[model samples]
Target chain A: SEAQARRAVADIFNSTLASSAIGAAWELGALDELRENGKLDVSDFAVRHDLHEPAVVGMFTALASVGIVRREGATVVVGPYFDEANHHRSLFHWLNQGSGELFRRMPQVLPNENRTGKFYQRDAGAISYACREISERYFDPAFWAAVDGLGYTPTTVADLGSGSGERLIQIARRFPGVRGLGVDIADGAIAMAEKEVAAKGFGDQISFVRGDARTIDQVSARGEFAEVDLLTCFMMGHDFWPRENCVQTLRKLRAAFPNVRRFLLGDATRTVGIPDRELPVFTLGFEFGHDMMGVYLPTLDEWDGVFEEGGWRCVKKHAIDSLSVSVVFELE
Target chain B: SEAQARRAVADIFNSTLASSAIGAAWELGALDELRENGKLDVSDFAVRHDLHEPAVVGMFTALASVGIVRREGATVVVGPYFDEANHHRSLFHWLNQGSGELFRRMPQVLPNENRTGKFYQRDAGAISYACREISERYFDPAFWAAVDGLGYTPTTVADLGSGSGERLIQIARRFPGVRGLGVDIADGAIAMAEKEVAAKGFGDQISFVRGDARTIDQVSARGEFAEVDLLTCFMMGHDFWPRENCVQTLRKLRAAFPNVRRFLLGDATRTVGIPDRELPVFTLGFEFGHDMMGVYLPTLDEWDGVFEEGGWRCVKKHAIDSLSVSVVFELE
Candidate 1:
């Protein structure tokens, strides 16, 4: 009984450690090297990478313990579970760099009540990579289904907080005649999205603008906004309007795009105070991580209250079980 | 396919966030409060604790997502799975304070190659609490079995790096006539050991001294090291000599306990470059964490070579799956 408890606690540390080790391996290209060569001597690998032998040996050992690698005498090869790890390498790297580091500092930060978290260089890349997988898995199909359920083809679309502009491109591809525009605050993200859109040869149909979603009218003033039949914001509504400004912002959205007929917005909501049964596992990270970053998250009731207060009537709300809340609303 | 990956990444973040949230709740006594009242109103709980309502609500929702708490209308209560969280509260608190903070810094620390990690308050308490569970679960049974298999009562025991002297006390209780002496460098730990020994009424049979294990002769010079028939070092062998002085120190152990008939030493080993399918999980944390702290972890081969060089003949070596290694040696 006691041992089990000890083991459980140890496992938590192990996971945290494994997260770092796996992250380090990915960052240093050790995983790539092992994957390419199938196996390599520890000394040779260290020499090749300009790393200390002992350090590499220690890392490989940690990795091997997690089944990410297998040591053969003095050499190491990727393990069977390598693919399982490789799939989430971007995420692992993301956490290790920023959120992971912030988490470790939570104890120190929590007591102060005034401390704020910051982002890292790897965050944009990590989020971009993660969005590739997330869009394919959850958003793409969910939105496609939403469009199908609506039984209408949107002539023009605008995406808010459109990181990398991938969703706008996806929307353009789905509806051949749809004119799409994506907006975000980060210059680097806007540059990348522009390049990606150009590469896809959809430059004529799709556009990118560097602007805050809260001030959509500014972009509208710059001739980017016209008759947007469908307006969409994904996983970013809470960020646009914190609790104090949420109702006001939603009300503004009605005027921001006067020609918009429908608004499809999706976000990870605060728990509805549901009784304990089984909640989606990832919801914890999605919600609390924001809290750690000092970001505000709205409960479903709070969101509903704001929507009603903001002169918007929910035409349909799609709950992806516990993972998030997706709602389609129109001006009341 | 993409959604699965998104879900996978989200799940990883969720686990990390949940771990920290649970740790925070335990540290803040939120769990205890909820347990006492069975439920807590979001606003009242926040006011009573002088915490931000939204922050606490966010935390409870994260906890509820993981089934650690449940919402009952406007209030939150301990969930059915809370016993699971309560069971490891000490550990959760431990990580949240020192190690937790250290882990968050791992990414920034790993790249520098020159930076080293440090500790914070409550680490020793956490370690001591964790050790009790560990010793009871794994080390105690294994060591006792080793004693039984040796088929002799140890007339005298001198334990190296004996924090809190719990192991020495246990040894004294197992063998009624056995004289015991424990050694450690921390003055506070030594004081704690003295209190524990007196509290257990074993003052007549067991005692403690503050000294570095590197120079075992110092304890011997204090008259506490006389005729230690069974010399033991539990979980402290790694910190004993380190790599540079390891061989020389092992050679000194025989001189340190001249009358010792059997020596049982146990510790966590560095990865031996062995090709393994899978090993115990905690080994990753145990080894890499030391690396992060700028501590050297010697490989098993390095240890074996040192033992041979030190003129000790290993009669037996025990591998406790992945958690640790045990060696029984005698002077050659």
Candidate 2:
């Protein structure tokens, strides 16, 4: 079992190299033409030149060296990286997700939840394969709408359940005026997101704070969650926990700071007419994990009810681009 | 016949769209990232982002209407125009080579060396292809070496059969004083090369002259050819038809340009070792084409005999990069 686990980790490491190999090769071949004609089309080379042998071979070698091409004698062909490059977010995202998967799946060869059909006791709910795809798809307009329409003039934001810190990245880019805390239990996603935030030189503006969304009582136990003008949970509440636990958690989160001006909750629930195609897939996948953890869906109405239950007044609710719902409520 | 031909043309147009569709989607996705990242990706949109979604859709629609993408609901992905954002020549070179398969196989395509083939005959030579690839591979390095090592002036040279006019562009960038001419037989190549030359603002000192290399007599007959101090062929000798014709052409060239102090013939035959796997496929293909075109390889001794036969003195036979041989010569 120990050997098998080690082999699994090594294979994951090798997969990155395997996937990157093809893109590097394709880039090498592409760079040849860009170098030749300042364009990507072979038009400059093929239409004008009679032979592409050297160009092909030249690209082949450079690409192969980076593991994007394999040399069978002198002939180089596209590798796995090639497939990933041509295909969007295929294996590149897989590499990113794989890192998270290792964290979630490593401690137990099969996590206790998988063995017993119970949810893991941790808050790894919002981290999924499609999370990045969806965040990137909706990040900009959603933020701008938050800034201009919803009147979220917060000096600081707490993005609980900030898987991969997508929300933090978006807000940091848009509202550079505000500092943000990206809280998540998944260390892999947090580290990856932190790496990006650091690369963007936003280390001062955004910080990845490790915590769970449902642990507001614990998170703010010693006044740790004060001075946050906006307390936000994205895609977190939809699968928070069992009916009783979710209500209790929301009550705790709402009560964390009476000084908090706004509390926001957004989800891809059916209340927003979530696409039929995306439903069975996204929901079941979310549910399968949630079911393992005894998580359940709360409608936007129920979510609003939770805020109302905690003495927060509903401020504004808007259907964004027919994809998801955004509701803002002020703490009373 | 007219109706059938019209239908055939329609079929061609439709299939072209279908083929370019997958590629375009892939490109657009990549392009969107570049735009978001604020990179200098050359898009038709440029810096103007205030346009309506319809206008943007219309632009993409126009591109797809012109067969760049496949028209589907919200447009399923296609090309790599985005991948080409910074590296436009990447996919351009690929498509250019791919288009050849169709042209090379069409019925009556070579009948009497049909207009399509004849129109671009000179640029269609295998050496042109070799030159393009070689130039791209060693673009910067070659220019540096040419200027630094050889006492070669980039501006004071003629790129004999300059195919797509890449050599002159490379040279011009390195040597602002480098005024050069690209000589080729195909008017299409000349036309295309001229547009690029002008677009790149090389019109001041660089021009692509349409003249057959076989009749170095015709090329030399031009009054402009007389003033060229150095005749540079990046990689052209292997494609010259027949030993005797090459000798005759060289003699005619030397006679016409008594003022031309030095001549350089770029050949990749003696130095570039054939890779073992490519021997059967690439090498054999090259040899077959060479034989078909009635060309012969002159060994070092044979080259000397030819030079002597043409009343030219062989100044030096230098091998470039172990894959290319450049023979320097002068009129006796």
Candidate 3:
């Protein structure tokens, strides 16, 4: 039994390892080739992607072990868990790509080692890409529904943490004549959002400016938030925390947007609470990642206290079953 | 059964996650506390390490789920796998800390994306630490044995890729009057080695200077390798590869260390070879990681050929069982 448990414990290493390889395959279009043709000719994929054939074959063979891929002579076919891995692809990307550096630098960071100059750094572009994919699949619907439930149209809207500029584009599509502005702190995220927005043909209707979401006033270019009536920030609420800092950020959002009538803030909170023996996809990852980064993740009650402390009135709280431990708080 | 397998798949993500937490504890001395007391006061660890308690609690709780730790009220007692995880601590550190960034940027790297300006970067300090820990445990004995087997001692020895200067210190300890020069490219590693070498009180017999091992002559601070009769390069054997490159580096080592009589070079070669479902600790992790980074790992035969191609004759090939898939080649 002890040996079996140790074997199980040893089992954990390969998941992260496989996930990285899977990500490598996904990004290099190897997975896409497999999906289209029902199998991947490893040699062909390697040559086409400017890759080494041995490593490519090695990746598939490694994947085949966990049933993530199947090898056939010179090619690879889908294995049993391939579809499931594909389905949760974003979570894998988020874990391996987005928060990977943070996790890897655990030794220095846990001691608040920044505390190398704040223990904060990452591939914001990768994170933005993963978050956008996740938001579109799971968070966007509930987010859109909550906005619609407000049952009022705003002349202009400001999307906070406007990673990829997806929310603003979708809002512009849903409501004609609604001008939108996107704000974020990450240079990489802003660069991605700008490129994506321009390509989507919404550059005129939706504009993005980079800035710290916490201090909205200072981040403004030409007082962008002054005319914004609806302010929406999904999944970034926790970034504004420790009660006092969060309260300050919220107060600044109001001060910066004089005409703002509604602020929709949402995030997956710390489970109230789990050790967490059971997981809902990203909850454990989200909680644990923040824990390692020294980022504070507030519970719903803690969020409530922040809202009250910031002097924002809670208008409605909407349930989000997709990400079970999360909710959207509509505030005024 | 499908669900069970999927659950098993989901289970892999956390080993890396927990390894990071385990690494954090080991680095911050929290794991030492746990071992000493057989229990850890989460709050006390936070205060002592200047860590936030919630995260420390979260880390131990997460560890508790896997039986690596057990939570009892505000303190945590050792779980069954605690010693086991501790025993393999360096591997965990290597996975989570050493190769973390390379693994995390899986998407950008697999395609040879740099192909961002070479896709090369890492926490060299952390890696050096992990490598030192690993080397001392599994490699040094084998390395020293191989050196001992040669039945000759050198006047001045140069260690190529002298990561933490451990090899030089150990050699100094073994062969009392030996003068040593340590060379490495990583600034972090050199800093660590300088401090470690100084602390070891062998600064007079051994000294460290930074440089790329591939082209050793130019890296010399006042021709550090001139008097070197013995030259040693370990584990970094893979960093020289792709036949042409490996041949070139091998030739350069000869040219640089002209007076060198015996060259002891060791590495974990590309398994001769495995897919490698049956792993010997780091074989899969090592192979896949190098594969993703566009690094070429040579098989023993390839290494043998390189020795011939580069004009170096192999005197003996020594097998290492500790990391079984590896060998130390004594060259002349």
Which candidate comes out best when scored by DockQ?
3
Q: What is the lDDT for A8 in model 2?
A: 26
Predicted complex 3: CAPRI docking category = acceptable
Per-prediction DockQ scores?
0.17, 0.01, 0.39
Q: What tens digits encode model 2's per-residue C-alpha lDDT throughout B1-332?
A: 53343332222222222222222322334344434553322232322432223323322432333223323445423333322222322122222221222211111121223334333222133335434654564343443444455454433667677888887887787778866888877788888899998988889878767776666665543756767776776556655536777778777767765666666665544324444222211222233223223346554456666777665777655543322233433333
Candidate 1 residue-wise lDDT, B1-332, digit = tens: 54553443343344455566666676566878877888888777667666655556667775665456777776888875576566655445445434644554443444544353443122565466555555554566657767776656778888877888888888888888788888788898889889999999998998787787688665545554556788777766677557657776776777776777777777667765333333334455556566656667666677677776765777666665325443333323
Q: Is the docking of candidate 1 incorrect, acceptable, medium or high quality?
A: incorrect
lDDT to native, each model: 0.64, 0.46, 0.75
* Native contacts present in each candidate (fraction): 0.28, 0.00, 0.46
lDDT of 3 by residue, A161-279 (tens): 88778789888898879888988777767787788888878888888788777876666484657788898998888888877898899888878876888888878888864554444
TM-score of each: 0.59, 0.33, 0.83
User: Candidate 3, which segments miss by more than 4 Å at Cα?
Assistant: A1-6, A22-24, A30-38, A47-65, A147-156, A177-231, A244-263, A292-294, A304-316, A321-324, B65-67, B147-158, B178-231, B240-263, B304-318, B330-332
Better of 2 and 3 by DockQ: 3
Tell me the RMSD of model 2 versus the true structure: 24.5
Write model 2 residue lDDT over A69-122, tens digit each, in one string. 455653344443433233322222222222222212211212222334432333
- Chain B TM-score, one value per candidate, order as shown: 0.74, 0.56, 0.87
Most accurate candidate by lDDT: 3
TM-score of 2: 0.33
Error of 3 at A307 (Å): 5.2
